[PDB]
Design a binder for this molecule. Structure first.
Ligand SMILES: Cc1cccc(Cl)c1NC(=O)c1cnc(Nc2cc(N3CCOCC3)cc(N3CCOCC3)c2)s1
Length: 285
């Protein structure tokens, strides 16, 4: 991994904070904007392994839809991981703050980028385990990149991941991963279907206020999230197939990328909408 000297790094603004380090926006020696994650002195061996392990995993990847690693500071303290800076932050928050501001075509293009990143990861034999809009970042070209890499650190550090009766983010997780700890690229496909629903709804919370146990029971009884408003039928047809109980029946990421690319290349295909089930009746004479 590229080792960066600390005199090349200027931390400008804290953008994320944790107990054991913070995430900063800063500049890297003209100088270029970067994001900087630190690990404070006193860290344990496991914290060091997890922290540098994230940088080790990201250094093995070179794709447009995967956050790019610039380098690390490991010879000085605090240790740091330096990556490209994504100017619009996390996708879930971004969509909630930009409700209704994009075209259907722009939304579908976000999903194609996420899918192409996930296709790369799956083909690299990397199972993400925590695919969700909160773990995708967005830049000033609207490009979405998969973020949040590691081993045990990924689900450990995610506040949405809860201890079940394994520590997992239930509303995003496929049934076999909940039931018996089977995390594969096909469980990431289920997650991706939830991310398709998050994007098309501008960041609605999956299953709204149902509790985690209620979500598991609904999924096991066969219920699935309803169509978003203004959602192309083909998009809904795709997210439903990501949510097949039988893992072998789900599309692979290659199928998902192929379908999305064909829809974008014939954008009239996105004008056919799935019916939306209204929850409110308004009657006027
Ligand atoms: C530095 C680093 C080390 C290991 C792994 C990674 Cl993926 C990274 N890189 C990064 O975390 C980031 C790269 N670009 C970033 N942009 C960014 C930019 C922003 N902002 C964008 C401008 O408006 C203020 C917030 C927020 C965030 N957040 C803050 C809350 O936690 C979720 C992300 C993130 S963070």
């Amino acid at each position: 991994t590229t080792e960066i000297h600390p005199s090349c790094v200027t931390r400008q603004k804290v953008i994320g904070a944790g107990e054991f380090g913070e995430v900063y926006k800063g500049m890297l020696k003209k100088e270029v904007p970067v994001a900087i994650k630190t690990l404070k002195a006193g860290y344990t061996e496991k914290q060091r392994v997890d922290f540098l392990g994230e940088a080790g995993i990201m250094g093995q990847f070179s794709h447009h839809n995967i956050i790019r690693l610039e380098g690390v500071i490991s010879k000085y303290k605090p240790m740091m991981i330096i990556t490209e800076y994504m100017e619009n932050g996390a996708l879930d928050k971004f969509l909630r703050e930009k409700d209704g501001e994009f075209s259907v075509l722009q939304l579908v293009g976000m999903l194609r980028g996420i899918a192409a990143g996930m296709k790369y990861l799956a083909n690299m034999n990397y199972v993400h385990r925590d695919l969700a809009a909160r773990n995708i970042l967005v830049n000033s070209n609207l490009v979405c990149k998969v973020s949040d890499f590691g081993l045990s650190r990924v689900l450990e550090d995610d506040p949405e991941a809860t201890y079940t009766t394994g520590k997992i983010p239930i509303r995003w997780t496929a049934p076999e991963a909940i039931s018996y700890r089977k995390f594969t690229s096909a469980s990431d496909v289920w997650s991706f279907g939830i991310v398709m629903w998050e994007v098309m709804t501008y960041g609605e919370r999956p299953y709204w206020e149902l509790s985690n146990h209620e979500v598991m029971k609904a999924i096991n009884d066969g219920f699935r999230l309803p169509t978003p408003m203004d959602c192309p039928s083909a998009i809904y047809q795709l997210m439903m197939q990501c949510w097949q109980q039988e893992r072998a029946r789900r599309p692979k990421f290659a199928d998902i990328v192929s379908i999305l690319d064909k829809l974008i290349r014939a954008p009239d295909s996105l004008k056919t909408l799935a019916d939306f089930d209204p929850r409110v009746s308004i009657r006027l004479p």
